[PDB]
């Protein structure tokens, strides 16, 4: 349903910080997204909340979820771990045409992987979820959206 | 040395695209950055050039470099592989005080890990390298810099 702007942020430090604030009371976070494109975002935000027990769900396949574990290299994928979560974070790639996932497979994921009473979140770039119609199709509790722009310089 | 602005980009697809362009003639790419916060950027951009032979170097420790390999989950760390590279991409976290790495250590890494005649690149956010004085301290061939801003919304 209707999503109201809470606040703005700037830079990577604040991007991680508003996520930490959003999940402050959570024990177990699940990040669901498209392998390759979205996996790095799951690893980045899991790192920011590495105190929690975190998992990565590929596409909408909860049975293939793996632990997001801290190593000397950062966050890496660990063993299969289809435990439900008290915050489920959908990544923007899921909403992409062609395999993002269909809305009914997404709703089944929410039914299966999010514990009853848990929070549904989205983390995306360039307003992907709003643009896909997903604010009307899903009941997000919180969405964090970032925009990216930049420059290439040569020596 | 002096870095001249070449072009601007917007969004994730274009961010990946300018990187693909910058390394189009490369065969093996090394990404060096701080584990945890920078590893995901190495994985993201490696995915974007998954046709190449790519490695992740933790901090400035070449001997601990690992292959960046594509799996059904995205890019994951594989075996130790301290082979030099024809493009070395320093990640912005390396320039952060406190372990970002000392500049002598970074110069050593460029000498050990970058092939003679290879290209030295920077990939950072929020203009980290310029702000740390690294355009004066290092001779980058290309730097790709992105800024992030966004919003939090609630349901």
From Swiss-Prot, chains A, B:
Entry-linked Pfam families: DUF2124
What is the protein's name according to its record?
A: Uncharacterized protein MTH_862
Concerning Gene3D superfamilies, the annotation shows: 3.40.50.2300
Membership in a protein family: To M.jannaschii MJ1183.
User: Which residues, by range, are in coiled-coil regions?
Assistant: none
Q: Which cysteines are joined by disulfide bonds?
A: none
In its UniProt entry, the species of origin is given as Methanothermobacter thermautotrophicus (strain ATCC 29096 / DSM 1053 / JCM 10044 / NBRC 100330 / Delta H)
The record ties this protein, via InterPro entries, to: UCP004962
